[PDB]
Amino acid sequence: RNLYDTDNIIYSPEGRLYQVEYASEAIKQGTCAVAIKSKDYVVVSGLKKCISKLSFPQEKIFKIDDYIGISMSGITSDAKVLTKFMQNECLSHKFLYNENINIESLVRSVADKYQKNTQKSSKRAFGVGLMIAAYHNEPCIFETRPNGSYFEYDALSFGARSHASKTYLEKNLHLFEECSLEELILHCLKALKCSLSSESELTISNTALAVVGKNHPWQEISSLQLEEYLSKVKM
Amino acid sequence: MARRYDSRTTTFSPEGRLYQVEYALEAINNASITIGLITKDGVILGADKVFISKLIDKANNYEKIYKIDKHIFCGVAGLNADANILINQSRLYAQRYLYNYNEVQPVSQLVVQICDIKQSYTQYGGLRPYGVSFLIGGYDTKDGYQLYHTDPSGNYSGWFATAIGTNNLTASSVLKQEWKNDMTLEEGLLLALKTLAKSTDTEIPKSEKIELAYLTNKDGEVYQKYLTEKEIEELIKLYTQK
Amino acid sequence: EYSFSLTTFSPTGKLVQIEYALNRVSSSSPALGIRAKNGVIIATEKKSPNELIEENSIFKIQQISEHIGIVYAGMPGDFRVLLKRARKEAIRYSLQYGSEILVKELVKIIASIVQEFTQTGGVRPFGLSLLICGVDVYGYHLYQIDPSGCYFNWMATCVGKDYQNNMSFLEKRYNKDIEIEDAIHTAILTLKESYEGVLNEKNIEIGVAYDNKPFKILTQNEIKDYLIE
Amino acid sequence: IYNYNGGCVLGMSGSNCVAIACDLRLGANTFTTVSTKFSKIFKMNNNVYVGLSGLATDIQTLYEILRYRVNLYEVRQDAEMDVECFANMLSSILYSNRFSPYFVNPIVVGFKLKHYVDEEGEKKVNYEPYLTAYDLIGAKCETRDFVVNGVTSEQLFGMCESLYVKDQDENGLFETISQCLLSALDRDCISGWGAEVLVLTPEKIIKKKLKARMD
Amino acid sequence: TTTLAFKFKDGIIVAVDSRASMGSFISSQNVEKIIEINKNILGTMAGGAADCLYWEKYLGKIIKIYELRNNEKISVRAASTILSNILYQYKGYGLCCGIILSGYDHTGFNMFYVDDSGKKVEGNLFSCGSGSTYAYSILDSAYDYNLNLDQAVELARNAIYHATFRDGGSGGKVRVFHIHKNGYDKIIEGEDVFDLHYHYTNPEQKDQY
Amino acid sequence: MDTLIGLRGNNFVVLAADTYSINSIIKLKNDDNTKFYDIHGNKCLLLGGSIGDRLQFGEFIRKNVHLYQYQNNTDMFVKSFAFFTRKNLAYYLRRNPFEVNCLIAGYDKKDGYQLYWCDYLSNMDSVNKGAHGYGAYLVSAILDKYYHENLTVDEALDIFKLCFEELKKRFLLTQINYELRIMYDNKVETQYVTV
Amino acid sequence: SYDRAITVFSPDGHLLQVEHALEAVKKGGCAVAIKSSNFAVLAVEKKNIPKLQNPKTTEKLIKLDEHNCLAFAGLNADARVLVNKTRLECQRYYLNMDEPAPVDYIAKYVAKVQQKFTHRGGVRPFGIATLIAGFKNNKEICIYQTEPSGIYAAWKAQAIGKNAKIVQEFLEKNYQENMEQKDCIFLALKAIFEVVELSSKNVEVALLTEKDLTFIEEQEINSMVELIDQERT
Amino acid sequence: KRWYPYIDNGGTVIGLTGKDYVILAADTRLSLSYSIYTRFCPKISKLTDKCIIGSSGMQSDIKTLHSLLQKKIQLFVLEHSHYPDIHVIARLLCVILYSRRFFPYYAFNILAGVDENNKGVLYNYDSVGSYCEATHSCVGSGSQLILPILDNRVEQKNQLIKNTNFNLGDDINFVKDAITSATERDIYTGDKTLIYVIDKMGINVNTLDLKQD
Amino acid sequence: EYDRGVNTFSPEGRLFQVEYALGAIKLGSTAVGICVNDGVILASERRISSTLIEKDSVEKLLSIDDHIGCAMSGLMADARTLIDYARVECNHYKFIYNENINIKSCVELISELALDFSNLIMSRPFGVALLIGGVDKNGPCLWYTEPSGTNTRFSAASIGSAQEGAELLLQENYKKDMTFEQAEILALTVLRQVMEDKLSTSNVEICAIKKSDQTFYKYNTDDISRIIDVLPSPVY
């Protein structure tokens, strides 16, 4: 414990790398973020963080390519390195070739960027987990842990009260056939509200939300458009 | 990651000092003593040969007063092992100055070169300092005979007479009390024996012991060193007047 | 961060890692060097081994060049890397200047390499002591190189275990004008008296300079005639 | 070797002394002189005299290196450096610039310093001439008698061959090398604005500057 | 290509043509050769087009940082020295540009002709370009240093015309500026069909010469 | 193309050079050019050759020499200054042309007044009289015929006048304006002559 | 080690390896600079063993350029290496700008390089506090105090080194705006050895003007010292 | 034996700007020395919604220079969250072009777009990092021929400056007139041409058919 | 640091160095910035250690570019290298792209240098807190950069030793709509409540970046006097 913690090289006598287990809980402090995969749409919503009622809400949703977007949850500085890496990767592929980067291959290209910061002892594991949501030819959601690892999901949640939001998603199997994004965007927004603490701030026009789908490039949901969605959430 | 194995040899102490240099100064305070003396005729360097055995060659060599250039020479007091590293380095410096500017290097300029390298190790690199400090006497046409005393820390200082090594205080006291400003070469040599004899609390030296050298520029920078034979006369002369 | 000195000054002002290296040199087989009027003798005792080993396959007295021999007393692994690196200097010198390298410059070069491992980071000091002897235009030489890197000029010396009384024995039996034949006689005797359980045959080694002849290592046929007395 | 900065260097061996000579011109272009003090004979050591001939830039630049390494060798040695050790060093120094050559044709002249007993009560012994000559890439063309380089190498070879005799003392040797040089410079129009014969013996060194034709 | 400068009684009058021609064909005829290097310092293009448009605007970048870290305005001597050094690093790379840096600094009015080979020079009446010789020729016979502004710009316009008249590669609109003790103004962003104005005032013949 | 003349006496060294700017070879550019690079330690360095390389080389020498004299409270000797200049000129010779001709001059406590002559190829050598550029072919003969031992400063300037009215009369481009740098009596005096 | 951050944030937020570097300055020699209308005087403390150690050490009062002073206070070992970088910098600036470096630019560089050594890896912070006197682009004298932490500021009359607090509080109460050439010598002398022994050998004072920095010789130094002991009686 | 790495694929790009628009027209023929590779290779690549680039040099360099520039522009959009103005793009292309001054792109580029309310604007380069705003510019094989034609109608040496007004419809017809003149007078000019009209709302890609000889 | 390096996660998920540098920004002089829809106003305390100082060379509100100005907190010497770095990057952007840098974009390149020690070159986290503001486009902006690297755009923030008190006053007296002058008097009142006895010229160095001119302006002794005379809060 006290001895098996100082560096990211020593294995605990149970074979656990503590210094990547510790960075794996920095994502558990970021605000919740939920991705829902429809038959042909992906909806990503995240709760922006306001440190004071003078400050602007912190940005949660980031755009990578035409049909690729992410939602970090962890250390903001570490995520900014990864978005630049991903953006410089989808653009180079669209430059060297004329195609769109294979989302499966792009996630692997960023999942091993986590890795190279784990073998050495002069580096640290990234403290950020990502939500790579994209529509390449079919909708797909990815998640990269601070240790080199990635998975393809059907729904996610990040950190703050993710267990509360997961319960809403774990019991909802409609999302596969949930066409009519109106019916799907409500499902995600209700999920995000579930993680949101009661007797506190409610979901307002300062919570991020974006979609990507068949002929729907990665777009934010405008506040005027978003505002009525929050109204149906109150129902 | 060898972080737990590091000693941080280039880190300040709580009182603003460097422990590695602090200990290196302690190392050169237990080494053999070396004497510097500036006379009107020339500059005198004389150190004490630490006894090892009678089987030492002690005929064509001694490891305290080396030659750095035809007009510069040094008397080392400290770790003899890493002195040869700095002696070879300063030999390179004094010969590359002559390569660039086509003239012999002034003594005050060699010292700052050999002190910068001595200091650089205690500034950055994570290496141990040079546990060595040596008087560097030499003659330069600009400011005449000079004598500089170096330091493991890298800070030097010009002097007229210095007695670094073990029991330096008892040898600086006699130097301070008997160093007349204007002395002849033979007079200075006798003073060197007197301070060398008194530093190691011996009434008379033995000549299987302390060795002497000087410059005494004769428009050609003769740079002579004593074999043991010439020092009996110096020992004889000391006995007659003391 | 991986190049930091492991040899650091102790508070009492001693490079304590070097003091440990000298402890191990003071526990190895005694190597011994003696110089005479017309040659230099380096001798070491190679303890009586099992008959399984091939004695000629290991020789503590190796040869640097035509007139420069060598012997060590320490860790055999470090001798080979130092001996091999010492031969490069003896060749690199001859690739510039026509003549064979001479002992004084060779010892200074080698001592600068032993000193490097004392100071540089991440490495330990060499755990051995060398006795480089040779014949030059400046007569005969016999040097010794400590693990610390400092080198000494000797007329006769010992480096191995129990070299305190071993060298005291030589002091009362050595003179400057000693004949080379008598030097080997004294070299055998001093090794003989130090070696407990005196069986000094098949477990000794001699290397001679012989008044500007090429450095030669006496095979055992030329040694048994020196064990009568 | 260039007509630019035309100059020649000559060395000769006597009975127990050697003489090294050169011309003092420094010609800017081929046919344009600017100085007549440009001595091309340098004192590497007490009995090691080197003579550099060719482009003066490389004459000086090489001389700095030679002087920087001979001093480094001697100081690290506490021993006077001998010719055949120095001579081989000059061969390797030139070769190290095999593809960016020092355009010089050096001459190395100086005694060899054997070291036998010389007596039951002596230490060092007689000396040997040791002439040698190189080229720009350092080919050790060692020779037991006169060696030449420079633009008048071919002019000097003819005269030295027809005038050199086996052994001569200091007085005899100086005259032959002076005649072998003056009358060889008078046949060159890019060198020979004043000679400087330097005959040296084991005891003394004689420097003479001849009254050469200046044309 | 033509370029002028005066350091006349109360300022500097920099004048250029506006022709950019490749080979023997006129690529453009409305190029701006004067560059706002600084509020007080302005340069000029000549020779190769990009080899000076890029570097002068690169030089403006260096000055802006220097003028901001030290919060004192840079001097023309220092600006020219910076430019000549960076153009010297490209000796054999084929650059070609003759720049006349003129401006006002604490030490009065300064001018510095800078060429592609690190050719910094301080003077009073520089001119560069293919038609520079004709431009020099007019100025040397009319330069006074006591000219007032009204006839200083007239002399500059007169010189640019006669240079563009004799030179094939010089022509187009004539630009004549003026450098104050504080900033500069654009006096003439003008024309060049005034051959029939200076000499041969009345269009009647072909102007034999 | 540009003329540099130097004359050394027992108590003086006078450096002469035309004040012309040959740039834009079809014409002159400046009538009062600056080729002299006066050094603090009673030294001067006169450069010929291309104007672009004169600034890059001469200014670089001036900084290094000044830096030497600031790191070391001494004043750098003329012999050191001369042979350090040759070293740098030869150092760049096989990497960058620097077609500049030097004329090193200065005063030294131990060696007196010295003049050094350097070609674009670094052919440094101390001389009693130097001449660079194409005008060397026409001013070297005056520097021999009319120069003798232990001249005084006034006679040396009379010699230099004799060289100047020669380049005007016989040399191809009749340089008219020249600048001198008289070093004598611990002074560095500057005067401009014409015709 | 080689490339490790040795200066790192203490749990209270301080940089311990810089705080310790400040304590290395306090174990030095006091230095005082005074500004005036168009000149600055610099007086420092020197320590020499009698009859030995000829005063060729000349630690403080370092020439940087034609007109640039420097009177450091701290580890003399780090003094030469830091100073020599500035002298290298001063000529490089005068090469890339063809105008001598102003006093403000040199101070900014010294503050930059000092702060660089407390931010890089495997480098010890300079244990030196310096102050620079010189003229800006416009001819206007200025003195720039510096600290090993890298912080720098221009001062009218500042004292650094051993027990600089006592000197500074004294120098703050009797500093006139434009003192005389002989007044600035007196104020510097009166302040420099308020903490140093009254002997005239201990203090070294030099005065900087538009040209040719001048060292004050022992004649008036002894003269003003005898005017100060009677002031203390 | 030396492998000269520069060939000219011909083709001409015509630019002409108006008060509130800009017309960029180019041919599509890609040809070797005297034979013809293909009869449709577009030389105009859109960059933003209101900025397009046309190049008429060597087609290998043009494809990578446009591709490099759109890669930079999209990278700029992501980092700065607003589409660059044409002035921003024009300056950026100058840096990219000059970044290889010592091995220059063998491409001549014309950059067209709108920055103000409309302010139809147009830049032209010469293979190396240099650009000046122009009312009309053309590059390529027909540069020598079209440029005189554009001058006579846009600027004037004419005694009376007729057709002072210039509606969008007539300017399109004028470029069709010009690009046809180059076709029948130039070897390398194409057979099918694309005409772009960057108006206030966007860009049109109306196509015109030319001679096939 | 007793057995840990710079890149070490605490068992709570936070880094050690950056959470230690957060305690180093609570010692500088208090600076208050206010962003209204007409331009950003930046105010700053002036802590003159002694009357001998020139009060001019020491500064708190530098300008990153022609349209950007910043405040500082924490290690003053450690903040100059950021501002100097940002100056080169801001100018470099203006060269590659002809326009002026977005304050949001300027902050990002500062933020990513604030963790250059992390190694995905510095060696320890920067220990300052910037208060950048400017008027690039989309109206004026005001940002705030932490040692931890997180940067949040503010409408009216505050840094320095008394930033906790200043943000308390701003969080009540700030309204979304103000004129330029209402911001200027508001900033001084916030400082007046937390500064020392005298609200003199030599105590504050307010600078403004007006939307209209789109250029920073360091108020001189005259422009600073007409704001103090307002005294909208004469409460003692």
Ligand SMILES: *[B]([O])([O])[C]([C]C1=[C][C]=C(C2=[C][C]=[C][C]=[C]2)[C]=[C]1)[N]C(=O)[C]1[C][C][C]N1[C]
């Ligand atoms: B001059 O004819 O020599 C000319 C000088 C020149 C013209 C224009 C510009 C320019 C470019 C872009 C924007 C603004 C201004 C700069 C310099 N240069 C040339 O004629 C030569 C000949 C062939 C290549 N160059 C154009």
